[PDB]
Amino acid sequence: AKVFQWFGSNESGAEFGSQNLPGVEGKDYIWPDPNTIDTLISKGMNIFRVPFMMERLVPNSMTGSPDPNYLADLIATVNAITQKGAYAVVDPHNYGRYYNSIISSPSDFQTFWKTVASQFASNPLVIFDTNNAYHDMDQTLVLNLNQAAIDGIRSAGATSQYIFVEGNSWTGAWTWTNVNDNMKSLTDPSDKIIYEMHQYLDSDGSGTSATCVSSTIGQERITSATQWLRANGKKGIIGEFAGGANDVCETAITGMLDYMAQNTDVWTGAIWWAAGPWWGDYIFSMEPDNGIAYQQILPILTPYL
């Protein structure tokens, strides 16, 4: 029935209001609604990516103890996804930075990851995502941070779970081959690395405009990444993508997903940005029942589900 291994949505909210640390739940940030996740599951989605802030989960020093209350909501969100049989992606949505400084210690990052993985180590439907969208930082450091995360996760006995690794240049698919070639060297004793790339369809690829460049821009922008995955014997996932509810973007989205469906030897699937309870009239909202993408884009995603 389904075309891809995974197809689903980001569930954004716990990383909102990032200028306020620790911030206040219900005021600066909010966790996803399990009831609307249930609706997306009924439509055929089977993966939900859950952004959160490292600084809220493990305050002050990333080698320290977790904050019990923010951790409790991360756990509740994750286990509600997995109790339904869907995969939950644990995403420290941190851009390679902690208190807005580049994470320069792989050893500290490895300890952070042992701490996080230890909370989920027996749940095979959890997916660990090393960090969202590394950018503007040393390329060997990005490799070493991803490897430190893998090592920390596996050291906790979390050996059944997939690990989504992310590259530099905001992990963009269109920029992957000439920036992130060194990422092919990552190692995992469980052999469960998936290369997570992001792809937006507006002029600069920022995903801040509802206008897409053209009706073929998604396919165009992931073609070289597809060939890189195949040449290197790797698997990938599109962990964020979106376009506006308009004709050109819808055609680009269909074209991109149809191209991925012809290349499932390397593409494991795709994850829309974004659902979550605090989006309102956001141009990309996948939140049931009234998000614009839930109403107008989901019908073009259903062929893959």
The binding site for a copy of itself (CB under 8 A) comprises 102, 104, 136-139, 141, 169, 172, 175, 178-179, 181
For 45, 46, 176, 246, 285, the CA distances from 83, given in Å and listed in that order, are 14, 12, 35, 35, 24
Shortest distance, position 147 Cβ to a copy of itself, whole Å: 18
Q: Which DSSP letter does residue 172 get?
A: B
Token pair for 256: 């991109």
What is the torsional sign of CA 116, 236, 96, 192? positive
| DSSP output for 111-148 | HHHHHHHHTSTT-TTEEEE--S---SS-HHHHHHHHHH
Q: Which CB sits closer to a copy of itself, 95 or 284? A: 95
Nearest C-alpha neighbor of 261 from the set 222, 210, 215, 232: 222
Shortest Cβ distance from residue 36 to a copy of itself (Å)?
Answer: 29
CB of 137 to a copy of itself, least distance (A): 5
Q: Are 1 and 263 in contact, with CB atoms under 8 Å apart?
A: no
Q: Which is nearer to a copy of itself, 179 or 300 (CB)?
A: 179
State how far the Cα of 102 lies from the Cα of 168, in Å rounded to an integer.
12
Which DSSP letter does residue 185 get? Answer: G
Least Å distance, CB 231 to a copy of itself, is 16
Helix, strand, coil percentages, rounded to 5, for the chain? 35, 20, 45
Closest distance of CB 295 from a copy of itself, Å = 30
Task: Provide, rounded to whole angstroms, the least separation between the CB of residue 101 and a copy of itself.
Answer: 10
Looking at the Cβ atoms of 177 and 254, the one nearer to a copy of itself is 177
**18 or 159, CB closer to a copy of itself?**
18
Interacting residues of 60 by C-beta distance below 8 A, sequence separation 6+: none
When the beta carbons of 62 and 292 are compared against a copy of itself, the nearer one is 62
| Structure-block tokens of residue 270 | 């795709």
At 98, the amino acid letter reads Y
How far apart are the C-alpha atoms of 174 and 302, rounded to whole Å?
25
Nearer to a copy of itself, 181 or 265 (CB): 181
Q: What does DSSP assign to residue 25?
A: B
Q: Which is nearer to a copy of itself, 41 or 137 (CB)?
A: 137
Write down the least CB distance from residue 180 to a copy of itself, Å: 10
Least Cβ distance, residue 173 to a copy of itself (angstroms): 12
Cβ distance to a copy of itself smaller for residue 123 or 139 = 139
Amino acid at 253: I
Can you read off the two tokens belonging to residue 73?
């909501």
